[PDB]
Amino acid sequence: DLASLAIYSFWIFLAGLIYYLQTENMREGYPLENEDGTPAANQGPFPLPKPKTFILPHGRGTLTVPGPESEDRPIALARTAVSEGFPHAPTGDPMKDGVGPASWVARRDLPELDGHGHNKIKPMKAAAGFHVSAGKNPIGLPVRGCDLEIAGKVVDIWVDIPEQMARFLEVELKDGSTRLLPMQMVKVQSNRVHVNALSSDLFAGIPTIKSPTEVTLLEEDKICGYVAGGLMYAAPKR
């Protein structure tokens, strides 16, 4: 019977496909590790897939995965129990140490580039032709924290050139310096920009960028991680 052969054959194919999908999704994060960073005894039912190499544009090299994994950064946490499976308490200020919901990854310390090799994200004042085209222009509005106190003022919008969209709001603090706030973490209102994740006194702690007209992938992670971490750790002040 052809129907039986077809359906029987299809289930075989399907079993192979699932095996392929499971292994493909092991290219990041494996081998598994114990809480102390050493290789775990149980690596799961599937073996690692053969490495694949991505050729990165603009002469930035390649990426081969799976490959040797390392955090490449200090992790300020400590065990709270004598066996596996329990939480790890921050040894210092989780917001400042970048752990928990305030974590950041050690991404390349260079800016993401568009198809033409130019910085993908730039402050709007430095982007030729770009301007607000709809909605309340946040530039010039005061920024309020969850403690209902004003922490600064919006001095510009950092835009994604190729995708023409707002990614960050640049906020100036009382000392004259500025910080970037993820667009997805602010509420633009008619008379203010509200930031629920942070209290006014935590804005100065937002990681700063080394160059004023660009932001690196590493910096974006530290900034985004820090702001999101405020939801949990700034709660006392919310």
Partner: protein, 301 residues
């Protein structure tokens, strides 16, 4: 008091984006179209430009001819009365030749010939458009994943109106062109073959269709959930894993113990969808040619 990133708060605009060049013949790209602030709240505001070379022109010509051939038949059935046209718009139908004619092209225009003509235009429009999905990717040096996925949808389409009718011995087996009529044809097809819920390929097809909504709801929600960490910039997260991709992976590992990577989830995506029409085409093709009654078949095998 917490933005959800479903609609944008503020839109920004810059010079019209004419796109990457690569090996594309710029002579065939139109100019940019109008900008829609309305669309800009949900997605991109820019319309156009579009690429239209010879193949594209051929495809749009056939596509329209197909649509007009059916529309002409409709007006005819409507007695050329505008009021009747709108009233019974969903009841009109361009049907294929009667069994008697088998696979010949001898059937009269008002009795099958016109259905064959319309179907010929559709055949040319669809396959030439498939050529476009392949070539537009080639000109940009991109993989051919889109053309391959499209081929899966084309498989079900080909089976329903061309391959199965041919194996059955007549065009009468094909699907008619009409809103209500193609629904009636669908119900009747199941009745005549002993209920498709007994067709294992049909039921798998359903698992994938439901699975696609299951997966896209999961994926759409996940990316938006980590968009505060630049999660939707998927290509760069693939090339240099960020906290967005790590938090997404851990959400699913902690919840259901899944293995998850930014690139891998998109492999689940393309396959979950592609399997809908792949298993489906096999299910339909086997109906009537190899299996007359799925219920009866299920009782044995």
């Amino acid at each position: 008091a917490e933005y959800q990133n479903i609609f944008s708060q503020v839109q920004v605009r810059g010079p019209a984006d004419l796109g990457m060049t690569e090996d594309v013949n710029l002579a065939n790209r139109s100019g940019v179209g109008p900008f829609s602030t309305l669309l800009g709240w949900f997605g991109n505001a820019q319309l156009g430009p579009i690429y239209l070379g010879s193949l594209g022109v051929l495809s749009l010509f056939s596509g329209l001819m197909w649509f007009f051939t059916i529309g002409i038949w409709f007006w005819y059935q409507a007695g050329w009365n505008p009021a009747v046209f709108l009233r019974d718009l969903f009841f009109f139908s361009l049907e294929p030749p009667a069994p008697e004619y088998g696979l010949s092209f001898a059937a009269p225009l008002k009795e099958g010939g016109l259905w064959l003509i319309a179907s010929f235009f559709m055949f040319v429009a669809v396959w030439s458009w498939w050529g476009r999905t392949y070539l537009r990717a080639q000109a940009l040096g991109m993989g051919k994943h889109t053309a391959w996925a499209f081929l899966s949808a084309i498989w079900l389409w080909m089976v329903l109106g061309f391959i199965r009718p041919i194996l059955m011995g007549s065009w009468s087996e094909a699907v008619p062109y009409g809103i209500f009529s193609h629904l009636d044809w669908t119900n009747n097809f199941s009745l005549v073959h002993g209920n498709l819920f007994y067709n294992p390929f049909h039921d798998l097809s359903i698992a994938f269709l439901f699975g696609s909504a299951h997966l896209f709801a999961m994926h759409g929600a996940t990316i938006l959930a980590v968009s505060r960490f630049g999660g939707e910039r998927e290509l760069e997260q693939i090339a240099d894993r960020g906290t967005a991709a790590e938090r997404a992976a851990l959400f699913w590992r902690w919840t259901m113990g899944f293995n998850w990577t930014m690139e891998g989830i998109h492999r689940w995506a393309i396959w979950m969808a592609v399997l809908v029409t792949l298993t489906g085409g096999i299910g339909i093709l086997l109906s009537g040619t190899v299996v007359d009654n799925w219920y009866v078949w299920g009782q044995n095998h």
